Symmetry: C2
């Protein structure tokens, strides 16, 4: 095995049954199928490398923002092995599924993954490490960095060291997981060190706000200055309102013995300070992270912390850079077994909640297979979701093996908690699925579901809920549902379906909101749909409404926020188009009010967080129109 | 076509495939397995072995993603180098290098990276202070205005640079630039002047622990600090200015004081927690029997009394730091703005084995092989130039790494074992030593490589240096390859990385004399350890020994005393921790010149070599 007159090959040690499965699938679907799935010539290390190193001049040729987007060698070492660790992960999942459920089930999953009936997320990591978690910093504050075992670090005594530890933890956790590193209680723990150092005279009183903002700066820029690749780890902050702070931290104490809930007003004030500082800082330099969410308790037409709500509403007026999380209860988070707690891939996941893996069901595929028959549709859907549950159970078993092998110290040190992680049934292409079924229309209010289309979506989501609920008793852990961001999946699934079904599949990309971001429809329709269906996925969705112009008054904005909250929307944001100049100043319009230079790019929420449009398009190009194999003077031989 | 076809097919020219097939026929699968080109490329087997390793014996998942691709990017690099050498020198030369690399006649360092990024550099922080983090293009970072942001930028730069290169990130002028921000923050009332030293030390702590708290893998980036003596500070920074416009040389005493503060802080900190990085070197100008900066020399001598944790760099001139000149050393002490883009080492014991004892044949083989190494270095350099033009190596674009300040390095290892196989080593009343003709032999070997290195500048348009490389793993690997090829003719389990092996018992004067003779031949590309059974009694005794060693011409050396650690990481001497009372469970030792746990030594050094290292009872 490994490297094996002339005609050098590389041989991986697969069970013969798996080789036979893969050979049979290639004959059935064709080389193009495997190529589309990333299991074609992507495993050619020589071709991969020669293509990679040649991309620069191509990007310079076609992209005005190439100079900002330019890839360096650190990306090479991350990308080169992804097709190989995906192939390994697919194989290992097949082995585990065969072990648990028999070869029939294992074979069916591999076929569904390759042909696009399902979408295994973070597939290059899937048999190696878990997806995501929203952490509490309590163990960092109390234990230091115990997951780093080659040196013993003392817990922070001061603000500077606390900030260092948080940055290091973020960087560490981002290499132990595929997804977001959430820090919803950051300001709870930062406040402790601000006060401690103030009391001790470490922070001069007359330099208090300066010291605070210096550390805001150090942490925030660190989370937007990537060491490897051209992208920072995905991080989340949450503005916890007074209800959430009181509920989550009831009875909990700081290292000095004081009750955390005795400090609520100070924690709120520090959060407000950050939100204000961040809004100011964007004009100095635009950045993405941490993704901002505010978590508000809202009930019977009222915010229970109206002071915080009006604050968030006010600060958002500038950039609309904060996502609104609305909940009608703090029961799930009270001083944090069937798992309860919001899980959302964009932001707003509750403290100590995560997902070890998402596998998404291709809903348009099922529409294509059903031929318009809604009963047939639901039968296929239920079977697919049952298959996905088995795959998730297998991945969880593999994760447990990795834990036992000492490979995932975030679990050993109690930062990531497996019994606080869902297995996620993802959905995408809800709209396109209904469209193919003949269940969408256009009337005076724009694009919408037909009356039967709405029932159909109800039935789809309710069917998945039922299977998710059954999964708990079946597999001993909790399943959630998410309408996933699908930055790549929305493209690749559409492409696979077009390969298989031709012109029956008319869409270039599948949607990640109940109505497509770029559908011409009345905003009331969007809100109504999110009000109907957000609750069905327990807040695993986002609604974001593009605004042509910022709100004129805080009052107008706030009335809209309350109306959306009244309708039952659980996570939403307003979208503005933010201009940047070549110097990175954020503003609106074509000319920078700071340096007078022209706009060269835009920041926008496309899947739920603010990114440069040039970054979106470059990534989109890389998967949407894959290059044919070409040769030059060297690579022709 | 290519990729997954089930087999995986890489796109190789047929000629390369035929060569590899021929080499497999000649040497056998065990040769490729030894070289890391056998079943290491089996991603499934590699992965299962990796993850189940903790289960079936007696590292976390981030190490997996680094290790899994190394056999593949080595294979790619070997191929790309073969292509480039074929282009530049013809197929015969390209083929010859590949054979030499696979069979162990030469040793391509950082082989998994060799066609992708360069080896090392000792940076000035001037571009960081003046321009911030310009190599990060996705955000524009303002230059630091305060000490806390300066420290952040240094940490980020180290982490960034460690992913743009294979080897050390040297920071020889760190304290020159740190001083500027210490002064600045004090003036602007950022620091309660009552807490000035606490404040400085807080930043010492944040920087130092960050550089010993690995985010990925079990090991931090390799970093170097240098205590620049007053001569070096004046020479290097003549005419240079801080951002406020003041002359740097107007602050020599302040910079010296800050350096001393760090060295003192470090020495105290090891009691709280033992750490490796940054590797500490002191650079001293020494001429005609005296330190020109005696204050600094006596300081280093004094602070070293506790842990001997600082390496001595000795030079008789500051001309090179005032056709590339300047010291290049893989362990520490590389001069400011000096690096190497790649090292390729010649296996000297292999040549001894091939020569059959014929010294003229030996030197003929040596000169041909060094000439082959120069061609391979030239090819690697052209590939690095390609990567630069492809926008992949931003440290070059941003003037942090400078290609015209990097050597191509001809490495040497196993000088001693090579001489031994030739019959030129003996045992006397004062222990193991080269014979008289053995010394002449080593002169001839080094002079031969020196001649070729010098010729290389006219031949290839860049400068070559020589280093007796640390060879942490190479010293084992090459010995094992030679054993496979030559059997009982090759008696050594590991080759030597010092002029006389650490594990050979000899009078200390012999070690010093050899280093005194030959360090200059490799322009300081070597290290000497003097292993001590116990700490020096007095500072005067220690300082007399240091001056004697400097007098003899030794250019880079350290004393070693075994440092104990308990399970909680406290450093001490003896069997019981004076801090927590727990038992010693491990030892720190220079593996080659930097202090690491003995348990972290690679297996062969841990079991074969380290236990046999000579320690001196008296000097
Ligand atoms: Na993902
Ligand atoms: Zn501007
Ligand atoms: Zn102890």
């Amino acid at each position: 095995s490994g490297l094996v007159g002339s005609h050098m090959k590389v041989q991986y040690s697969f069970e013969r049954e798996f080789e036979e499965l893969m050979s049979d699938l290639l004959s059935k679907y064709g080389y193009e199928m495997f190529q589309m799935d990333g299991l074609g010539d992507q495993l050619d290390v020589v071709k991969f490398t020669e293509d990679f190193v040649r991309r620069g001049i191509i990007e310079s040729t076609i992209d005005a923002n190439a100079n900002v987007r330019v890839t360096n060698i650190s990306t090479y070492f991350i990308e080169i092995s992804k097709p190989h660790t995906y192939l390994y992960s697919l194989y290992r999942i097949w082995q585990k599924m065969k072990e648990m459920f028999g070869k029939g089930v294992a074979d069916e999953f591999v076929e569904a993954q390759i042909n696009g009936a399902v979408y295994l997320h973070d597939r290059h990591h899937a048999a190696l490490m878990p997806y995501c978690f929203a952490y509490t910093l309590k163990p960092i504050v109390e234990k230091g960095l115990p997951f780093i075992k080659t040196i013993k670090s003392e817990p922070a005594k001061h603000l500077s060291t606390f900030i260092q530890h948080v940055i290091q933890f973020v960087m560490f956790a981002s290499n132990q997981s595929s997804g977001a590193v959430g820090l919803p209680d950051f300001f709870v723990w930062m406040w402790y060190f601000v006060k401690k150092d103030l009391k001790e005279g470490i922070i001069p009183r007359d330099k208090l706000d300066w010291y605070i903002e210096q550390h805001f700066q150090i942490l925030t820029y660190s989370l937007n200055q990537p060491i490897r690749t051209t992208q920072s780890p995905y991080t989340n902050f949450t503005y916890l309102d007074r209800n959430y702070i009181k509920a989550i931290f009831e009875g909990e104490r700081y290292p000095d013995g004081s009750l955390i809930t005795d400090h609520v007003e100070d924690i709120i004030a520090l959060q407000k300070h950050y939100w204000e500082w961040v809004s100011r800082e964007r004009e100095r330099q635009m950045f993405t992270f941490p993704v901002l969410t505010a978590s508000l308790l809202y009930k019977d037409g009222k915010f229970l912390d109206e002071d915080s709500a009006r604050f968030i509403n006010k600060i958002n007026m500038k950039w609309q850079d904060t996502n609104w999380y609305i909940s009608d209860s703090i029961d799930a988070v009270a001083s944090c077994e069937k798992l309860k707690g919001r899980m959302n891939s964009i932001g707003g996941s509750d403290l100590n909640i995560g997902s070890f893996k998402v596998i998404t069901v291709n809903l348009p595929r099922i529409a294509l297979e059903s031929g318009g028959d809604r009963e047939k549709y639901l039968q296929i859907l239920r079977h697919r979701v049952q298959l996905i549950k088995k795959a998730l159970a297998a991945v969880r078993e593999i994760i447990k093996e990795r834990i036992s092998e000492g490979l995932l110290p975030l679990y050993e040190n109690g930062l990531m908690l497996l019994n606080r992680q869902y297995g996620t049934i993802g959905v995408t292409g809800v709209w396109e699925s209904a469209s193919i079924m003949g269940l969408t229309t256009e009337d005076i209010d724009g694009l919408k579901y037909t009356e039967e289309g709405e029932v159909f979506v109800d039935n789809v989501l309710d069917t998945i809920r039922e299977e998710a609920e059954k999964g708990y008793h079946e597999y001993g852990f909790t399943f959630n549902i998410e309408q996933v961001p699908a930055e790549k999946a929305a493209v690749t699934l559409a492409q696979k379906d077009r390969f298989l079904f031709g012109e029956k599949q008319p869409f270039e990309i599948y949607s990640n909101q109940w109505v497509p971001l770029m559908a011409n429809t009345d905003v009331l329709n969007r809100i109504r749909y999110s009000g109907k269906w957000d609750k069905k996925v327990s807040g695993g969705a986002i609604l974001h409404i593009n605004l042509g112009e910022s709100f004129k008054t805080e009052e107008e904005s706030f009335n809209m926020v309350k109306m959306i909250a009244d309708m039952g929307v659980m996570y939403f944001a307003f979208n503005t188009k933010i201009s940047v100049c070549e110097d990175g100043h954020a503003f609106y319009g074509e000319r920078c009010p700071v340096c007078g230079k022209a706009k060269v790019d835009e920041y926008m929420r496309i899947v739920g967080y603010l990114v440069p449009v040039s970054a979106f398009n470059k990534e989109r190009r890389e998967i949407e129109y894959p290059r044919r194999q070409f040769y030059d003077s060297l690579t022709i031989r």
